[PDB]
Each structure stands twice: as structure tokens, then as C-alpha cells.
Symmetry: C2
Subunit: 630 residues, 2 copies
């Protein structure tokens, strides 16, 4: 069958073990998450301008009664219910948050004459809804300052729902960010963007229903609001180690924590309230050193040290600690302990992964050997809801030693679709492998079943019996998973094995924010090597609006670009505003039109830029993951 | 049997294919490598002070006749013979190199009154031997300037064979390096050091004999000299983009290429000779983006761009191009082409890996899909002797997307020693798996055999039949490998499967150069978590010779350290020179003695530092790789 199955006896038993192993009697988070509530609006529904729906929570009504569901890990169920504590809250005097309107929180700090707003959610409609809630409960006041705590779309993406460019231009609104915001806001999402976004469908569970056999939570929030991605550039950057400022009479200390959860990030200390806003360094979960959708491995050592610096600078004096995800902590001794343990969590993960690695434990083993000590294991905010000890330990190991385990048996591996037929043959053929795998399934050996049956799937991708057993086993693993990403991934893979992948199926602000060099780097990634083979051309590119020149050199099937160089020998020189180049690439405009408008001038051979663009391919979104290519 | 086998018919056929596919008629490198030879001394043998042998080449006499050996890839054999072109050479007027005295080259540039020396080989004895050769052939002159081209031990390691500290102290010798040398010289070799050095035994083939069924070459040189590792700190750093200097009347342009082959590296342009020294950005082979022994993935995009910057700055004017490995290129048009193609090699590798990845091709497949275009494939300096297209394409993919393929079948994998029994069972048991694997072996399917028989090895590590077949198959892959690291690794793995791993079995200058923060980071990696569990202590550490204070905080089984902080609440305060702390850790001294000498003062609880040190474990070098733990 093609539908979700009940949790097996083995999965049920695994959930009871979770209950035996974790501190469910510690219910203090339920108090914390309701503390200071001003309004929880009754039927949240946020729509976008084009009529699409950005966010709603009605889907999670099944969680409200608190009754345990064996298709959900009970530790994950606990988090899922706590993340449903949404609405407008007071953190401290003149400090509020709107939580559960998006993946992240949005913070409103009362100024003498207006608000200082920290972060802006993922899309303008959710930010605007949050602001409207604030206005209704607390009174309407202008926003004079918007601060980006760090460079991720769930923090800067809704900025246009709060402010417009003319308010920035007139100086009515400042935008404050850590130095390195603009580079960090775009870079890592670009060159490998289609791969990352497709893989993220699994981690976010975008094709799953909301429900007990579907998506239930996203660890740091319910999920990501859907809508246009906005971004307005900072007018003031916090440099070096940080800075002390006064904003509309309120004193702010910014502590830059470069290269932890984001390349550009800062904590915020508010001495008048003794309130510490920990960016996304410290949330209600272990975070990602490595995000499954795919990016570079983060530095656990620097992350751990930056938390210790916060602890040393502010920990002694903090009365409340709050975050850009999840809920606050009140009281100095609690806050000190949370900081200490989070510092030591990332620290232990790092140091002990390398301790094992130095003993010869490989990237293929470390997750099955590394275990937190009780002092770190037994806090709810250290649980692997977003990150996991398992995939993080692997990541630290991969950061230091790479993907290769050291064993030359694995140095030149056959692609799995090329080794699959032989695995299957050696195992007695498809029916015999299925027979053996079903017996393994009936002993609950799901981690093994998904390994071996995946071989049959890759040998015989249209074998329905193998797809359905693989899916069943993956599902049970998803039911079992404490980690929301893991859960979403397993259930998504079962979904695609049962149903197949979608047959039926870019932000202008993001493009504007991309450095020109990176834009040409991406066009080089698009280059179709067959079309480029044996060609050679070069183009001088002049961009007067931004005062930058590039030299583009196509040769040996590689597109090169260099900032601030021109060649007397280039075959063509193209003058074009970056803003117009952007419009061209977003297909808001044609090349011919820009000529006619006096916006795209050319000397030399006028065909070369057209010829280069004609060499660029595109990528299909819905690539195969759990089977080989159709 | 336990001894190397003949190349099989299939391996022989693979070598003939190599000959059919690669441009062996292009023999110009043989001219290049002999050009300007002044002396090749007849029986090179370099000894260390303790009586050990640092370097000799008699082992490779089998290569001298040029006759093809089917146990060696003929493209690798070609490189192996070219790397045997050792001795003292002229590059251009007043510019010489000693090649083949170590893995790297050492360069002597004639000053008005002395030598400027670029790099220093791996150990003092090989440098000193090189210098003595120079003195005999060209006359004895003092060295006034030593330059480190980049931060690797094969470049700075022999410096004490050329100069002593008092010559530095008096200002008779300057030492010039790129900014970031001292950090780069140590950092990446530390935290994961034992794992990297053990794994390197394979890549370097340290247990193999020199000979046709053993080690034959190390791509960028013959091999690494063995001896003490020296390092003296730079007295002058080249900052920013680079610098123009005159040294003993000779004009030098330094072009910093930070973050390519090393974090701190620079090319050198000598306008008087029109001579371009390309550091290790450009060598006689494709280089590592990822070195098998294990380190972080290098940035192919920046590497490619830095070569293009060199090409644009100097390429137009260069008459000779030479390197810190391998041999020079003469003539402007040849030099331009080599730069272009190397730029596009790293560029193509990068862009096309991501092109495929954006199509859904995973880290498990990309090496079997990515192929260089003919213009890059068909040059000898683009061959994968040191790096490979295969392991590099995987590395670029791992840099951008990580180790995880996106398929949740592989998200929570059983350790191989835990899945092995089940693979073996499913395949009919050990004899049946062996029976099938031998038939596969007899069709030449060695890449498959080493995958499947490795499963039997990990299930049954004392199964001699499985070890010996695994070894045989690995060996044939080593015979076949164009890459010297791959070859050494396969042959080393066969060696350990047949013979078992060694039962019978630190630089003071390196330790001195390590940043104190990193030293305490490493001690944290050593922390035995069982011994630390439930303990908490803190220590103020004061280091007067270096004017630095640290705060050490042990808690939650994690050792923390913070530069420039002290705590009034620390349980102990220890004052100690860094130099004395180093001696302590190198066991050149005892803690008690330093007290008695007035060099280690303490207040507060005097036991805490001792207690912390007693929690630190150590690592065994000779860990198991090709089998599970004995
Ligand atoms: Zn973030
Ligand atoms: Zn966030
Ligand atoms: Zn190097
Ligand atoms: Zn080198």
C-alpha cells in the first residue's frame, strides 16, 4: 500500500524508551513559553498580496490536547507543542516579541518616540501581521530602527512589511546590521542553490501534510512562512568586536559573534532591562553545525568560545535571556546555566568528535560512538531537534578530515546505481533480498532495512515491492526521530518512493544584493560545457551605476571573471548598469529594449555577449533523490 | 599468498589504454627538466645528526632505464622519471634551484653580496646539503635573506640548516613571509593531528618498499625527507595584496594569494630576469583541493582567480616560470598557456562539479560523471598525479553540500562493522560471498571487489581468505592508479591486510610556534571525558614572557579557554612562562623543578592544574584502518 502505516510494535517501544530516558517531569518550559503573554489571536491566517497563504496554524490543532501519539517521538512532540505557544509576549519592561507568526521571532523594543525592531521574519506579510498585532495591543507607534541580528532570510526577509525605501532614504528609518551582513546574506545560497533548495524539500517536509504521520514541527519554529523574499541594505554596520549605541534613548550593546550560526551575527545586550538577546547562537535546541539541505560545516570551536564571551560579558548581570527562536529564560542562575551548558555542548561535540577521530574512529562510525554526558544530555534546550549530535559529530569530523574514511576500499567507489545490480545478484536476486529484508523488518532492524533495500531500489527503480518496503522502513525511522529535519526527511522519502516525485511542480531584492563577481561566478556554474567546448571569447563589462568594471574570459570550457580589470584585446566592450543587467537576468527586460533605451551600449564585436549567454544551461528543480534518474 | 602479485591481464590492458589516451609523444618535459643542469651528484645520500638517513635516491634506480613496467601506470611512470631529474640547475641569470633533494625545491637568487633563498626544504640536513652543493659549484656566499613562499613544513622545515637564531637576532639574516604564515604554519596540523598523520602513512606509502610493486613517486617530488622539523619566525611579513621590495640589490614583487594551496602563500615576480616563481599555486600536476590524509577542502574558485591575477599581472611579460615543486617552463607563449589552463582547470573542476550537483548528481556519483575537456585533459601538468579530478570533484561537492547525499537511506547509517554480518548473511555466508567475489575478480571488476569483500573483512577481520582477496584486488587498483597518493594508499592497504599493522612501531620549534589558545584547544581534545565527568574547576593562567593571560574553565566534561580574561573566582592562579609550559609539555622538564627554579608560581588551590593534566588522555598512532579494532 501507498499510505502511511501505524507505528510498529518496535517503534512504540522506542517511544516508551524516550519517555524513560528524558526529563519529562521538568515541565518548566510550558511556564516559560506562556510567561508574559498579551494576546494569542484565535485563528491565525496570514495571506500574501497575490492571494497565496503565507502562514497558518490550524493544521496543528491535533497537538493542542497534549495526548501522546506513537507516530511522533515524544520529545519532538513536547517541542512541537511548545512552538505552538504563539502571539504577543512581554519579555521585560518595554521589550516584547511576536512568536509563532513565522519560523523566527520578531522583537519590538520601546523607544522614547517609536519602536526599535530586531529582525523582520521571512516575508513581508508575516512581519506586517506581527506589527498590526503590536499596534492593536500596545498602540500604534512608528518604527525608527530595524536591526538585523544575523544574515538569514528568516530574519531579513520580511523587512518590506515594516518599512519602505523612501523612509530609509529620508533618514526616518535606519537599518543596523553586523559587518559582513550583505555578503553573508546572499553568498552561501547561490552557487549550489538548486541542489540545496531541492534537498531542503525533504528537511522542511514541504510535500507532507501537517499531522501525526506528516510534518509536526521545525524545531526552532513551526515551519517557514511562504511568500516573497525582501531585503533592504543596512544604513549602519556594527564593526569589529561590537559597539555601544543609544537608539531613541535606549542603550544597546552589540557583541559581534562572527562565524558561528551565520558568518555575520551579533548578540544584543540591553543594560537598562538587564536583557540579553542571544541572536541564534543559543536557541531552544541543539543547532546545526551542518544543515542537511547542504552547506559548509560551521565552526563549533568558535561558536562555543563566542557563547563563553557572552557569558563572561553579560551572564553575571543578565536577568532575562531571550532569542530569535523559541522562548526566554528568566533569572540569573538559570541563564548562567543555560549559557554554560550550551557553550559546553558545542565544545564537547567538537572536542570529543576529534578525541574519537584521533583514536581512528571514522566519519562512518563516530555518530554511533559519541554520546553527550548526562549534564548536557538531560536539558531540553540541548536536545537534537534542529541539529543532532549524530549529524553534527559527522560534520565536525568532515570539517577536519573530509568525506573519505581512510580505507582505500572506499576511495574510488562505484556510483550506487552501478554497484546495485551486483549487490542484488550477490544477495540471491530481488525476491530473495526482499524475503530476507522483510524478516529483518519484522525484528525492527529499520536502520539496516533502509540500507540494504535502497540497493534494490537503485538496481530496480520501478520495483514497487522494493519501493514500498523501503518506504515503510523509512517511515518507522521518521516516527522514531527526535530531530524534526530527520523526521521530515524520512517521511518525505517514503512519500516519493510511494508516489513518485512531482511531474506537475527568484527574489529581485536578493539578486540586487548579490555581488557582481558572485553573479558571474554563478553564470559560470550554469555554463553548458558541451556548448562551450573549443570556444574562446572575452568581454569587458562596464557597470557605471555601481562604478565597477569586469573582464569576462571564456576559455577551455571555463568562464572566468575578474573585478577591476579591462583588456585592450577583449572582443567586445559592453556598458550596462548593474540594475539593468539584473532586470535582464530576471527577464523583466530584453536586451534589444535596453539598447533602444540608451541603457546597453557596446563596442567591438556585438555578438559575443549573446553568444556567451546562449551557452548557459538551466537546472530542473525536481531532481531524483531516492532513486536513480528516470 | 602474502606477497605482491603480477599485474593481471586486465591491469595490463588498462595500462595500454593509458598509452592510447595520453600524449606520450609530447616529450618536451624531459628537455625542460634537464635544462640548465649544473651538477647532478652521483650517489645522493643525506644523513641526519642522530645518524638516521634523511634522503636518498638509490631506491629508484629501477626507473632509470625508462622501460615500461605494467605494475605502474605509464603516466605515473613518466612523472616518476621526471622527478628523478635532480641536482643543481640554472633557471635564468642569477637564479638557481636544487631539485630532488627533498619533496620540494630550494631556490637561490644571486644578490649583490649574498644569496636570497626561497624556501628551505623539509629538514635541516637536506637544506644544508643543497647549500653545500651550491657552494661547491657556484662558490660559497652568505645567505642574507630567507623567504617562505608559503606555510607548509616542506618549505620552512629545513630553515635551521641554513641559518641560526643569532644571525637573525643580529640582523645579519632577515626572514620574509606572507602575512598569516605563523598561524597557517601550525593550525591545521593540530587538533586532528594523530588521525591525519596515521592516515598519511597510506597516502605517502611509508611502509612500502621503493620499487615497481611499492612506492615509485609522490607527484610533486619523489617523497618527503625524514628528519627534525625546524621553524624560525619571520622578521618581515608581506601584507595586503603584496609588496615591492629590493633585496641585496634585487627587485622582488610579492603577490599574496591568500587561501589557495595554503592560507598564507605568495607568488614572486623578479622583473630583472622576467622570472615568475608561482609558489605552489601552479605545479607539474593537478594539486589537492582535498588531501586524502585529511584536512579542510580548499577553495578552487579563489585558487583559479589568483592564477588569473598572476596571469594578468605578470603573464604578459614572463620569460620563465618556475615553481616550488617540479621543473620550469620557458617562453612567454608556453607560460601564458600553462597559466590559462591551470586557471581553467581549477575553475572547470569547481564550476562543473556544481553544474552536476545542481542537476542532482551526488557526492557518491560526481567522480564517475565529471570529465575534463580535451584542452585541459591533454596536458601533462593537468594530470591527477597529486590531486585527482575524482577526489577533488567530490571535495568541491562536499565543500558546498557536505557528506550527506540527500537520500535518507544513508542519513543514520550503521557503522560498517555493525552492518557487515548482515551483508555477509544476505550474500549466502562467507564462502558464498568469496565464491562470487572471485568470479568478479576474474572479470577484472576490482572497484566492485574491493567494495563487497571489504564487507566480509569488517564482519570477519581474521578471515585470511577474505583479507588476501581484498588485498589482491586493492593491489591491482594501485598498479592501475595514475595518482601517486591513490597508488600508495591501495598498496599500503594490501600490505596491512596481508601483514597486519605495526605492533612494534614532536618538534620543539612547532610547539613554540603554536598559539597558546590553540594549545589549550588541543589539550581539550585530549580530555578523557570519563575522567572529567562531574568535575568543575577553573584556573587563571598567566604567561609573562608572552604577556598573555588565559582563563581555563573545566565544566560539563569540556575544557574551555579564553584569552585575555581572568576570574576572581578561579580556584587557582598559575604563573608560568609559555616557554616553560612548552618544555613541560615536551617532557623536557617536571612541574616540581620549575617551582624550585622560581619559574612556576601558584596561588589558591595548588592541586587544580595537576588534576586537570591528569584528566588528559593520549592517542595510539597505529590505529586500525582496513579492519575494525583488534
Ligand atoms: Zn539564522
Ligand atoms: Zn533563524
Ligand atoms: Zn605547500
Ligand atoms: Zn610543497
Amino acid at each position: 500500500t501507498t499510505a502511511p502505516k501505524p507505528p510498529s510494535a518496535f517503534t512504540v517501544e522506542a517511544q516508551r524508551r524516550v519517555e524513560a530516558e528524558l526529563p519529562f517531569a521538568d515541565r518548566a518550559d510550558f511556564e516559560r513559553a506562556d510567561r508574559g503573554l498579551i494576546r494569542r489571536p484565535e485563528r491565525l491566517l496570514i495571506r500574501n498580496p497575490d492571494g497565496s497563504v503565507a502562514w497558518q496554524l490550524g493544521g496543528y490543532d491535533f497537538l493542542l490536547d497534549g495526548k501522546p501519539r506513537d507516530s511522533i517521538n515524544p520529545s519532538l512532540q513536547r517541542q512541537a507543542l511548545l512552538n505552538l505557544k504563539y502571539g504577543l509576549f512581554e519579555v521585560a519592561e518595554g521589550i516584547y516579541q511576536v512568536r509563532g507568526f513565522d519560523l523566527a521571532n520578531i522583537t519590538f523594543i520601546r523607544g522614547d518616540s517609536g519602536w526599535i525592531v530586531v529582525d523582520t521574519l521571512t516575508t513581508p506579510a508575516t512581519a506586517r501581521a506581527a506589527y498590526e498585532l503590536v499596534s492593536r495591543e500596545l498602540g500604534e507607534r512608528p518604527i525608527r530602527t530595524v536591526i538585523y541580528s544575523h544574515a538569514h532570510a528568516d530574519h531579513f526577509g520580511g523587512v518590506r512589511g515594516l518599512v519602505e525605501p523612501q523612509q530609509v532614504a529620508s533618514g526616518a528609518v535606519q537599518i543596523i546590521a553586523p559587518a559582513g551582513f550583505m555578503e553573508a546574506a546572499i553568498k552561501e545560497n547561490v552557487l549550489a542553490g538548486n541542489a540545496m533548495m531541492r534537498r531542503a524539500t525533504y528537511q522542511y517536509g514541504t510535500q507532507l501534510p501537517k499531522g501525526p504521520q506528516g510534518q509536526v514541527d521545525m524545531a526552532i519554529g513551526k515551519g517557514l512562512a511562504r511568500g516573497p523574499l525582501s531585503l533592504l541594505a543596512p544604513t549602519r554596520l556594527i564593526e569589529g568586536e561590537g559597539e555601544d549605541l543609544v537608539l531613541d534613548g535606549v542603550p544597546f550593546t552589540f557583541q559581534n559573534t562572527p562565524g558561528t550560526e551565520s558568518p555575520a551575527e551579533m548578540n544584543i545586550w540591553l543594560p537598562r532591562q538587564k536583557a540579553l538577546l542571544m541572536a541564534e547562537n543559543v536557541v531552544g535546541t541543539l543547532h546545526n553545525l551542518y544543515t542537511l539541505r547542504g552547506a559548509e560545516v560551521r565552526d563549533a570551536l568558535g561558536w562555543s568560545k563566542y557563547i563563553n564571551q557572552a557569558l563572561h560579558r553579560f551572564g553575571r548581570q543578565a536577568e532575562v535571556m531571550f532569542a530569535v527562536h523559541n522562548w526566554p529564560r528568566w533569572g540569573n542562575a538559570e541563564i548562567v546555566e543555560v549559557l554554560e551548558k550550551q557553550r559546553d555542548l558545542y565544545g564537547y561535540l567538537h572536542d570529543q568528535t576529534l578525541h574519537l577521530a584521533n583514536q581512528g574512529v571514522t566519519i562512518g562510525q563516530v555518530h554511533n560512538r559519541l554520546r553527550l554526558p548526562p549534564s548536557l544530555d538531560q536539558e531540553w534546550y540541548d536536545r537534537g531537534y534542529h541539529g543532532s549530535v549524530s549529524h553534527n559529530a559527522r560534520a565536525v569530523l568532515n570539517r577536519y578530515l573530509g568525506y573519505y574514511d581512510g580505507n582505500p576500499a572506499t576511495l574510488d567507489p562505484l556510483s550506487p546505481e552501478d554497484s546495485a545490480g551486483r549487490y542484488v545478484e550477490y544477495m540471491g536476486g530481488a525476491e530473495r533480498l526482499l524475503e530476507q529484508a522483510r524478516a529483518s523488518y519484522a525484528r525492527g532492524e529499520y536502520r539496516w532495512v533502509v540500507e540494504v533495500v535502497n540497493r534494490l531500489v537503485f538496481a530496480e527503480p520501478d520495483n514497487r515491492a522494493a519501493r514500498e518496503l523501503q518506504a515503510d522502513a523509512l517511515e518507522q525511522l521518521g516516527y522514531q526521530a527526535e530531530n524534526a529535519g530527520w523526521r521530515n526527511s524520512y517521511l518525505s522519502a517514503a512519500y516519493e518512493l510511494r508516489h513518485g516525485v512531482p511531474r506537475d511542480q527568484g527574489s529581485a531584492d536578493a539578486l540586487a544584493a548579490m555581488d557582481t563577481g558572485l553573479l558571474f561566478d554563478y553564470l559560470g556554474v550554469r555554463l553548458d560545457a558541451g556548448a562551450a567546448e573549443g570556444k574562446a571569447l572575452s568581454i569587458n563589462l562596464r557597470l557605471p551605476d555601481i562604478g565597477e568594471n569586469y573582464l569576462l574570459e571564456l576559455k577551455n570550457s571555463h568562464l572566468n571573471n575578474l573585478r577591476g580589470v579591462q583588456s585592450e584585446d577583449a572582443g567586445q566592450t559592453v556598458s550596462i548598469d548593474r540594475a539593468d543587467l539584473n532586470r535582464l537576468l530576471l527577464k523583466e527586460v530584453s536586451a534589444v529594449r535596453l539598447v533602444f533605451e540608451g541603457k546597453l551600449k557596446s563596442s567591438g564585436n556585438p555578438l559575443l555577449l549573446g553568444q556567451l549567454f546562449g551557452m548557459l544551461g538551466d537546472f530542473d528543480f525536481w531532481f531524483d533523490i531516492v532513486t536513480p534518474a528516470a
